[PDB]
Amino acid sequence: SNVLRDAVKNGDYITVKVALNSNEEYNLDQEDSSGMTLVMLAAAGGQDDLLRLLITKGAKVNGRQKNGTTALIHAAEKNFLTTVAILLEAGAFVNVQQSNGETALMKACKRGNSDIVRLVIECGADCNILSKHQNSALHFAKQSNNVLVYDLLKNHLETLSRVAEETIKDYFEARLALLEPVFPIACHRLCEGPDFSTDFNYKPPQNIPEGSGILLFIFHANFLGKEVIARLCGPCSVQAVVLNDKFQLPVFLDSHFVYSFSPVAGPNKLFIRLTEAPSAKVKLLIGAYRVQLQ
C-alpha cells in the first residue's frame, strides 16, 4: 500500500519491480493532499527506470496538481533533461499552465537550459503564451541573459511567421496581402485537447487602408525538426469559433480554415472548439491578421 509512495519518493527499483509483478491491485494515480501522483514524484527525482516501468504499467503521464502542475513541469524545474525526453516520448502535453500562468518552456528559459528549449519547441510548444504577470517565455529568456536560448526562441518564431506568409501567398495566389498581425500567433497541439482558449489585446493603428480587413487563419501544420510546413486546405479540425460569446463565421462554406474576425479594441477573448483525435500528430497555428484586398 503506502509502501510504494515512500519507495518512489526514494530509490527502490527492486521493490517496485516486485510490487509490479505481485498479485496486489495498486492505484498508480493516487494523489496526496498536494495532488502528486507517483509518475510526477518519480519524475521529480530523476529516477528514470521508474518512469519506464510506470509508462509500461499504464500511468497517466499528464496528471495535474491542484495548482495545475504536470510531471513535465516538475522535470523542467530541475533540469532533468533525460526525464523530459522520455515524457515527450510518452505523449506528454507541453503547453499546460500553472495557476500563475507559466509553462514548462518558461522554466527552462528562466534557468538557462537551451537543450530543454529545443526539445520542447521541436515537439510543438507555444512560445508567445503569457503568465498572470504578462511576461512571456521570451522576456524570461532575454532577462536571464542566455543568448542561445533567446536566439532559439526568436528564430523559431521568425520561422513560424515566415511560413504563415508563404502559405497564405500560396493559397490566395497573391491577389491578397498580409499587412500586420493583430496578436502573437499561437500554437495548439491537437492531441492535447479539443478546446482552445486565449486572451489578447487589440490596438488599432490610426491609418486603416479602406478596403482592408481582419481575418482569422487556422493553419494545419507539421513540425519536422526545425522545418515547419502548413496548409489551409484538406481535413479541418475546426468546428466553431467564439469571439466574446459571439460566434464567428467562416469566410467560405467549403472550408473552415479562414474565419471572419471582427475584434473590438482592448481586451478580447477567443475560444475554438476542435475535433477529438488524441493520436493526431497535428499542430494548429492560430493567427488573426489585417490584410489587403487586391
Numbering used by the authors: 567 to 860
What does the paper say about this structure?
The crystal structure reveals a bipartite fold consisting of five ankyrin (helix-loop-helix) repeats followed by a β-sandwich domain. The last α-helix of the ankyrin repeats, helix α 10, is twice as long as the other ankyrin-repeat helices and extends along the β-sandwich domain. The β-sandwich is tightly packed onto the ankyrin repeats and helix α 10. One of the β-sheets (strands β1, β4, β5 and β9) wraps around the C-terminal half of helix α 10. A structural similarity search with DALI34 revealed structural similarity of the MPP8 b-sandwich domain (residues 741–860) to the PINIT domains of the Siz/PIAS RING family of SUMO E3 ligases. The domains have the same topology and overall fold (2.3–2.5 Å RMSD, Z-score 8.4–9.4), although the Siz/PIAS PINIT domains have a flexible N-terminal linker in place of the rigid helical linker (helix α 10) in MPP8. During refinement of the atomic model of MPP8 CTD, we noticed that the eight subunits in the asymmetric unit form four disulfide-linked homodimers. The intermolecular disulfide bond linking the homodimers was formed by cysteine 799, located in the loop between strands β5 and β6 of the PINIT-like domain. We therefore conclude that in the context of the reducing intracellular environment the disulfide bond and dimer interface observed in the crystal are unlikely to be physiologically relevant.
In vertebrates, the Human Silencing Hub (HUSH) is a key repressor of retrotransposons, the subset of TEs that can replicate by retrotransposition. The HUSH complex consists of three proteins: TASOR (Transgene activation suppressor), MPP8 (M-phase phosphoprotein 8), and Periphilin-1 (PPLHN1, isoform 2).11 Periphilin targets HUSH to its genomic loci by binding to nascent transcripts with exons longer than 1.5 kb. TASOR binds both Periphilin and MPP8 to form the HUSH complex. The predicted ankyrin repeats (residues 548–728) and the following C-terminal region (residues 729–860) are both absolutely required for binding to TASOR and for HUSH repression of transgenes and LINE-1s.14,22 In contrast, HUSH repression of an integrated lentivirus reporter is maintained, although slightly delayed, upon deletion of the CD, or indeed the entire N-terminal region of MPP8 (residues 1–499).14 The MPP8 CD binds di- or trimethylated H3K9 peptides with micromolar dissociation constants.
